[PDB]
C-alpha cells in the first residue's frame, strides 16, 4: 500500500489472505439508506483458516478494504466485472449474477511483439580444393621414385 | 448460466469402485465450488463433498471419509467422484452442484445455485 507524502511515497508491506478464506456478498445495496449503492462488492474474509469473520469491500486487483466507504447512487442498467481470485465475478443490477474466468473474457494486448531467435550452431567440415597428395601426383615424372 | 451433467452412474456390488463425472457447460467452471449431494429413497438429501473453486479445498460430509474423493479437472471443465468399497448405506439419488465463490456454507445444499438431474446408482446383494 502507497500514499504520496508530498514528494515521496510511503509504502507498507500487505499482508496475504488466501482466496478459499475469501467470499463476496449477493447484495450490493446499502441496506441502510435505499437509493445508494456500494461501487465494489463487500466481501467477507478471515486472515487464516480457523480465525473470525471479518467484513470488507473488495478492492483493485484482489486487494481487501477494511472500510466499506466506497458509494455511488443508484444507477439503473448496472453491469459490473470484478476481478476475484483468478477470475471475475458478475454483478448485474447491483445483485451477483455469474462468475468467469480469464479465458471467457476477450483479451486484448498492449504489448508490443519482437520475436528475437539465436544463431544456430554451425558446423565447418575440412575443405581443400587439391590436397597435398593430388598437388605431389599432378607432376608427371617423380625423381624420388 | 452454468449447466452440469451427470454420467458413471451404475449397477455396482459392495466393495466395488466407481468414478462419476460431473461435466460443466457455459463459462466461469474455475471460479465455482463443485459438490455432490446424495438423497435416499424415502428419505431427504444430505452433502457428500464438495471442491473449492480454487480446487485447493476438499470438504467432506459428516458421515464418509476415505472413501469419496471429489477431484477437478478445468481442462475438461468436469468434477470426478471416485467412490470406493461403497456399502448398502452408502447408495443413493446423486446430484451435482455449483455454487460461486459466495459462501462457506457447502455443507448446505441450499446454498449451491446450479442444480442437475442427477444419476442413479444402486447397491444390492
Known amino acids: 500500500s502507497a500514499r504520496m507524502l508530498g514528494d515521496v511515497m510511503a509504502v507498507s508491506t500487505c499482508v496475504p489472505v488466501a482466496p478459499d478464506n475469501v467470499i463476496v456478498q449477493n447484495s450490493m445495496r446499502v441496506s441502510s439508506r435505499p437509493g445508494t449503492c456500494y461501487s465494489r462488492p463487500l466481501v467477507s474474509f478471515r486472515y487464516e483458516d480457523q480465525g473470525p469473520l471479518i467484513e470488507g469491500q473488495l478492492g483493485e486487483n484482489n486487494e481487501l478494504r477494511l472500510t466499506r466507504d466506497a458509494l455511488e447512487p443508484c444507477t439503473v442498467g448496472h453491469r459490473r466485472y470484478f476481478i476475484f481470485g483468478g477470475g471475475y465475478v458478475y454483478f448485474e443490477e447491483y445483485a451477483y449474477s455469474h462468475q468467469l474466468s480469464r479465458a471467457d473474457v476477450t483479451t486484448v494486448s498492449t504489448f508490443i511483439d519482437l520475436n528475437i531467435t539465436m544463431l544456430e550452431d554451425h558446423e565447418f567440415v575440412p575443405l581443400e580444393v587439391y590436397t597435398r597428395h593430388e598437388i605431389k601426383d599432378s607432376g608427371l615424372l617423380d625423381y624420388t621414385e | 448460466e452454468v449447466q452440469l451433467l451427470e454420467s458413471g452412474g451404475g449397477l455396482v456390488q459392495p466393495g466395488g469402485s466407481l468414478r462419476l463425472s460431473c461435466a460443466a457447460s457455459g463459462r466461469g467452471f474455475s471460479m465455482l465450488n463443485v459438490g455432490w449431494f446424495r438423497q435416499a429413497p424415502g428419505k431427504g438429501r444430505e452433502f457428500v463433498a464438495t471442491?473449492?473453486?480454487?480446487?485447493?479445498?476438499?470438504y467432506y460430509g459428516d458421515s464418509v471419509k476415505g472413501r469419496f474423493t471429489i477431484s477437478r479437472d478445468n481442462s475438461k471443465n468436469t468434477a470426478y467422484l471416485q467412490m470406493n468399497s461403497l456399502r448398502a448405506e452408502d447408495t443413493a439419488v446423486y446430484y451435482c452442484?455449483?455454487?460461486?465463490?459466495?459462501?462457506?456454507?457447502?455443507?448446505?445444499?441450499?446454498?449451491?445455485?446450479?442444480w442437475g438431474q442427477g444419476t442413479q446408482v444402486t447397491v444390492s446383494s
Open positions: 471442491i473449492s473453486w480454487t480446487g485447493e479445498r476438499t
Open positions: 452442484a455449483a455454487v460461486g465463490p459466495k459462501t462457506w456454507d457447502y455443507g448446505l445444499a441450499s446454498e449451491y445455485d446450479y
